[PDB]
């Protein structure tokens, strides 16, 4: 390993996660993933909590007891 | 005269004479004159009250209870019964196997509860609540209608009574009535009791678990508007605690139909109930979309105009329906096909208040997930307005609750919607042209994790274009983005790293 290789592995991981999160990759990134398909497949062998809905409390009691 | 003698006879030790004295009195209470003579004699009324709660002869208890019933038609009669300790005796009679006695007893109590000052406390103290709930298993619908109305009067504005009703199993008994009988007056009176109990934090869950939502739903198409409205109000009060209920198909289908009503109260309630039931329940979301809920909700919004008591819950329902379920994508597209985009974007402007604006922004964010909505949303002027709202809300957070909404929520919501809209190249140009990059970079410093996420997110989308990536770097985004790299939030860390990679990719070739 080396700084250079660390950079590559990190970029591959980020790009794969970014695509998984639903964002499109650029043309150079798609190319990058091809150039390092080895690292990609290497990692390929290694989310939620979004639009949660909130209820509205419509109840309104009378007064006293 | 007669009264004095009859009174004496009722107190006689020979049981055979009292029974004969009871018939005479009961017979006399059926005539105006003699009736008034009876109610004006404290001794007579007291004797009747004693004879009733002591006799063991069916006909005697029936004639005494019947006499009291007749007297209860008048103000003086009600007072005399009250003062003679008649309430405790009447409550005791609620345990009589004789229907004739029971009917006279509950009806007399009903007249006291409706008109006699002090009657409610006296009935509660005598244990009338527990007795009434226990009688809910009878099958005479006119008897049940009166009994349930008594419970309504006793429970109204009295938390103590509501809890006693719950402990006695009132919820299941009341729900059973709604599922078992068809008599309109009974259904109506029972729905009113349930409405009173539905605002209580203890009764609400119990009513829902007893199958209350589904039972109330059975009557939403009844010709009786008073019954329909009372069911709708109750359903709405209960709705925030019913998002986990099953077997809601029928109710959901009817609520969607009611959205087309001309009655404002029906429409408002239906929208409110649907808003809560579509909360995090994918089966409910699926069913609502299946029966044309998107089109109906869009129409409801169109017709409501500026009536926020309707548009707010309708918009929230739409937001719930365009997210996290197998048919969300179809729903996102449906809103456009039914001409809903123009009105949704319109709601972002005055006179809309903050709650509705927040819901609308959230809906737009979901609608933007559908590429076919990117251009029309843009063409409706959504982007400059979202940016304006974002800028003002951010400034407010730098200089708490406004109409119940924190401006941090607006910042997060607007940046979130712009994040999705930025997936489109033409939208990116508009977004960037509004000089938003400096702002997005500053939001990177927000202490709110979700704000950091959408700010990094929109910057990431914008960075997919070479020129924009350069402009983002020119804004000193590198430092704040670098700090986000160790965030616990994968999204934040991923978007931040992505912007950094895209910025240092462009030209950055050799060293120096």
Structural features, described:
The complex is a heterodimer of chains A (65) and B (512). With 65 residues, chain A is mainly α. Chain A is built from three helices and no strands. Helices cover 54% and strands 0% of the residues of chain A. Chain A starts with a helix and ends in a 21-residue tail after the last helix. Chain B has a single domain, classed as Leucine-rich Repeat Variant (Alpha Horseshoe), CATH 1.25.10.10. In chain B, a hairpin with a 2-residue loop joins strand 1 (401-402) and strand 2 (405-406). Chains A and B meet through helix 1 of A and helix 12, helix 17, helix 19, helix 22 and helix 25 of B. Chain B: One of its GO terms (molecular function) is RNA polymerase II-specific DNA-binding transcription factor binding. Chain B: It comes from Mus musculus. Chain B: ARM repeats lie at residues 1-41, 43-84, 85-126, 127-168, 169-210, 211-239, 250-291, 292-334, 339-380, 381-412, 435-477, 478-507.
Compact overview of the structure:
Helices cover 54% and strands 0% of the residues of chain A. Chain A is mainly α and 65 residues long.
CATH superfamily of chain B: Leucine-rich Repeat Variant
CATH architecture of chain A: Orthogonal Bundle
The separation of the N and C termini of chain B measures 125 Å
Give the percentage of residues in beta strands of chain A.
under 5%
Give the overall shape of chain B. Answer: elongated
Report the CATH superfamily of chain A: Beta-catenin-interacting ICAT
Shape of chain A: rod-shaped
Give the count of structural domains of chain A.
Answer: 1
**Main interface pair?**
A-B, 29 and 45 residues
Count of spatially separate domains of chain B: 1
Distance between the termini of chain A: 75 Å
What structural class results from the helix and strand content of chain B? mainly alpha
Please report the first level of CATH classification, the CATH class of chain B. Mainly Alpha
User: Mind describing the biggest β-sheet of chain B?
Assistant: 2 strands, antiparallel
CATH top level assignment of chain A: Mainly Alpha
Helix content of chain B: over 70%
CATH topology heading of chain A: Arc Repressor Mutant, subunit A
Rg of Cα set of chain B: 34 Å
What is the count of DSSP helices of chain A, taking H or I runs of 4+ residues?
3
- What share of the residues of chain B does DSSP label as strand, in percent? under 5%
Main location (chain A): cytoplasm
Subcellular location (chain A): Cytoplasm; Nucleus
Pfam families (chain A): ICAT (PF06384)
Protein name (chain A): Beta-catenin-interacting protein 1
